[PDB]
């Protein structure tokens, strides 16, 4: 129940606003979603324990225009990345243009937040992967 979702139909919520609304996140029945095209912002919240081996959050979000990634550890914002198809000029390694975010092995648990918007149907698949998952990616 640590993979949770919040639909922000206002599209106005920022990271600070979302952190005030943690109780509004509800558990996902699968690590993916699809919604008809709308101006909503979909937020993902993933709570993870301290990690022992290299791992990544993988996201395949075709046609997502704005994707914002935030990592929180010990109540503080430790990572803050703005990407998506409407943020060009960033070179990504994978042919699929999937997104990878490295999850630190630093003795502390974490919470990740991802904001996604599109003018197209809003869809993504996502999961935590280790090195073994990484080397088979395309």
Automatic annotation (TrEMBL):
Source domain of life: Bacteria
Protein's recorded name: histidine kinase
């Amino acid at each position: 129940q640590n993979w949770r979702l919040l639909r922000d139909e206002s599209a106005q919520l920022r990271i600070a606003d979302v952190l005030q609304r943690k109780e509004q996140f509800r558990p996902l029945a699968k690590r993916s979603f699809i919604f008809p095209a709308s101006p909503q912002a979909v937020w993902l919240q993933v709570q993870l324990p301290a990690q022992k081996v290299p791992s990544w959050l993988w996201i395949f979000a075709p046609r997502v225009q704005y994707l914002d990634y935030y990592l929180v550890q010990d109540g503080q914002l430790v990572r803050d990345q703005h990407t998506g198809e409407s943020r060009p000029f960033q070179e990504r390694p994978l042919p699929s243009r999937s997104y990878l975010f490295s999850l630190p092995v630093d003795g502390k648990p974490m919470t990740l937040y991802v904001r996604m918007t599109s003018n197209h149907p809003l869809m993504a698949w996502f999961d935590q992967i280790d090195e073994a998952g990484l080397v088979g990616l395309e």
